[PDB]
Request: fold
Amino acid sequence: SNGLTDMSQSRYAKMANTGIDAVHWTNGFWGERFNVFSGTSLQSMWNTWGDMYKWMEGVASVYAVNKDPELDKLMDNFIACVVKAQRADGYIHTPVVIEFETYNLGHLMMAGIVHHRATGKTTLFDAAVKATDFLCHFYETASAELARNAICPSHYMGVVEMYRATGNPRYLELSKNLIDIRGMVESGTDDNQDRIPFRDQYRAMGHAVRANYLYAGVADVYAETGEQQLMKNLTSIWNDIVTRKMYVTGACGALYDGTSPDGTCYEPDSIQKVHQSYGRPYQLPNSTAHNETCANIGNMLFNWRMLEVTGDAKYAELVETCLYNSVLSGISLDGKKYFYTNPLRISADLPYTLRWPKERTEYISCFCCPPNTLRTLCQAQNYAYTLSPEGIYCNLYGANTLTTNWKDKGELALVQETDYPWEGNVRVTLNKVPRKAGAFSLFFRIPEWCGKAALTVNGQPVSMNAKANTYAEVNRTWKKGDVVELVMDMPVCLLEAHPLAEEIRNQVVVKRGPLVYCLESMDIANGEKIDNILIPADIKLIPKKTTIEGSSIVALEGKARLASSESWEGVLYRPVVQAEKTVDIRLIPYYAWGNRGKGEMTVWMPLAR
Reply:
């Protein structure tokens, strides 16, 4: 009835969200993050002073969980200004919200839907339904060659979410036309994924935000139309991204600037510029990885739609990877500063200055991404579970309550206890089961990273059928007070990459559970230089809780090998040096990088096998 995204009536969906109010984080990783975001980040962003509709959507999303009546009033005031400013035909003149501009309207749609779902009130929603009608007029009337109107890619999702929210067929028809038009124009571009029609695209293409939001939006249309061809496109594009063009943190977009295609084409007039963009297959540089935070949110939201349309746990893995490692990295631990880029390496020898700061900044002003970052992070709880007629799916582990209504039957409430992501032990406790529910299942995702896992029910072992990257089902007539307990082994992992990824050939990245780890220069004993650190393949890395900006994180401590250090000044090639020494290093989670001053950082490190 009521989720952040509601595929509950969608004819070719398989799962749908829990209600926007059903899941609260409690006592761990996400509870702690949620207190920062709700109790600091939102105020801090209003104080520095389209962005606002994202902020507000965030306020409503937080409110759905905590019911702070001071937020409800702060919303009613924001909404009053919005409503006072709207015309009869649905337009809004943005200047007259006091205390080709069709781009802001798309964000009003989602703000209004989310507000409706959280508060019950129709005050902002009616402002949104009108804005939507205005866009339908705008696309029925404006010139075929306005690709620019929809250069806001939020639109595709917002319009399908409005059809979902109203039943109004005009909105679904608009969203179908928006796909059908792509590439029915003179000189579209790879960079705007519109050189060729959508149905001819079987690979990821250009500006990664535009790309990924497109792919998401199309999955949303697929949820409603069941047009198989779209899923033929969406599955080779997903495949292209994930096996060939995605950083290990889930982030997307290797190139600040470049050309598409690269080194394959003989008409140079066919070769176009791209920016903030996907690159060649296996082109995954580190220092110059763009990985705009919103592109990574895009990949997350793409994967979430693919999960709901297919029921396949492998899409849930990507939602998690993205959330911890390329979305949460976008904000500081103090909730106040933001990244635009998410590089996988900072070297102080880097002889040019890339665009965009490389320390987080509290300066929303210029970037339109931090509002999207904060509202997304303010909604993490809306990704923990999904439902279907078969039962309930545990997708993102973390300490929480869930209270849904289970069909026309009554409340079902459960309590999830775990120190995830720091440890791999989950306990689901059933508080309320409605008496007339039959047997029904509780599904537990087994992470792709997880090699062993076991279940118990009230202490009694179940046979574990499932493999990595699939759901373990537990079908049972559940009684009040029942207890399921997932134990996932969560060892330290060393990962290598496909040999065609030259930028990381013969190097290793360290995961533990779902967190990608990195090394910063201040965690190397004796200020020994980060470039000289080698990870032997059989290194023994030891978890140890430690504190950064008042947050308890698991670092990994161990003995790396140290390269002898000849000066690299004015030298490109030289005789391989000895590497007889050792040095104490400490790895921290990537997301927590850059909270301890300026320094050096790398995810991928030399491997000694």
